[PDB]
Design a binder for this molecule. Structure first.
Ligand SMILES: O=C(NCc1ccccc1)c1cc(Cl)c(Cl)c(C(=O)Nc2ccccc2)c1
Lengths: 11, 262
């Protein structure tokens, strides 16, 4: 959930 | 002795670049938060939630950035968790501006942020807090520490450790220039579990730690060991993230956001 948000926010 | 040399001016430009990036990524700064809390702004005065009646009035007249439980304590906690999601996005956007960070293995980038965002959220909550309460809804609202504390168990104690941290942390009187580097030092912690390449993270942290030390010497003539004191606070923050995580277990197993939906 967190990882998902971070990952898309990063790209 | 300290000298104004090429090495120092690089650390000053690194500090200035992080400040600029910090202002870009976090709309509500400590300077602005302090001007609101101390009534030293021309900006619209926040609505104070200090009891159940002012919360009812407040829910209506403080238009939030998202939106249904019959229970007041659950609706407050929900708003908090939604704002924390927003905060992860802001902190990630900030992380990207730290020189070397986007150059790290994406997996390591995810790990640093995954473990860091909670420590940085408690740091940035302090900016929004005085002894009486916390600015909410990007400063449209103020919720008192005692009203949060009056909420039924286990919600009454969710914010107490943030206020405890904030009373002692705000007494250090850091400004936005100090916090920008502090927050960057926390993101680049080479001891997060499951990191692949530690050494490249410690190299950036070493540069950030040098920049923080110079920032605190120039900016704080009144505390010669503020640098040391600020590292002791990173040691604390771990513990409050521990208490927060174990309380999010109790809640999730004891009770019942649009970007998770998509
Ligand atoms: O908006 C809220 N709650 C919904 C609600 C408030 C009143 C009436 C009905 C619903 C809320 C509450 C609380 Cl204690 C907090 Cl700390 C927050 C927050 O801004 N938390 C926050 C702020 C900055 C960075 C990270 C995290 C947000």
């Amino acid at each position: 959930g967190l990882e998902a948000i971070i990952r898309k926010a990063l790209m | 002795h300290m000298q104004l040399n090429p090495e120092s001016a690089d650390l000053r430009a690194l500090a200035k670049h992080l400040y600029d990036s910090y202002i870009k990524s976090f709309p509500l700064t400590k300077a602005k938060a302090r001007a609101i809390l101390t009534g030293k702004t021309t900006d619209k005065s926040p609505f104070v939630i200090y009891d159940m009646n002012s919360l009812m009035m407040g829910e209506d007249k403080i238009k939030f950035k998202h939106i249904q439980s019959k229970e007041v304590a659950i609706r407050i906690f929900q708003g908090a968790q939604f704002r924390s999601v927003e905060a992860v996005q802001e902190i990630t956007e900030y992380a990207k501006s730290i020189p070397g960070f986007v150059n790290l293995d994406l997996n390591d980038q995810v790990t640093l942020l995954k473990y860091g965002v909670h420590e940085i959220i408690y740091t940035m909550l302090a900016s929004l807090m005085n002894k009486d309460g916390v600015l909410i809804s990007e400063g449209q609202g103020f919720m008192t520490r005692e009203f949060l504390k009056s909420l039924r168990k286990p919600f009454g104690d969710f914010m107490e450790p943030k206020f405890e941290f904030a009373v002692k942390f705000n007494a250090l009187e850091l400004d936005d220039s100090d916090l920008a580097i502090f927050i960057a030092v926390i993101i680049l912690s080479g001891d997060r579990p499951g990191l692949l390449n530690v050494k490249p993270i410690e190299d950036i942290q070493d540069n950030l730690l040098q920049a923080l030390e110079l920032q605190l010497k120039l900016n704080h003539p009144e505390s010669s060991q503020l640098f040391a004191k600020l590292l002791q606070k990173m040691t604390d923050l771990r513990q409050i993230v521990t208490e927060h995580v174990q309380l999010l277990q109790v809640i999730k197993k004891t009770e019942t956001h649009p970007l998770l939906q998509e």
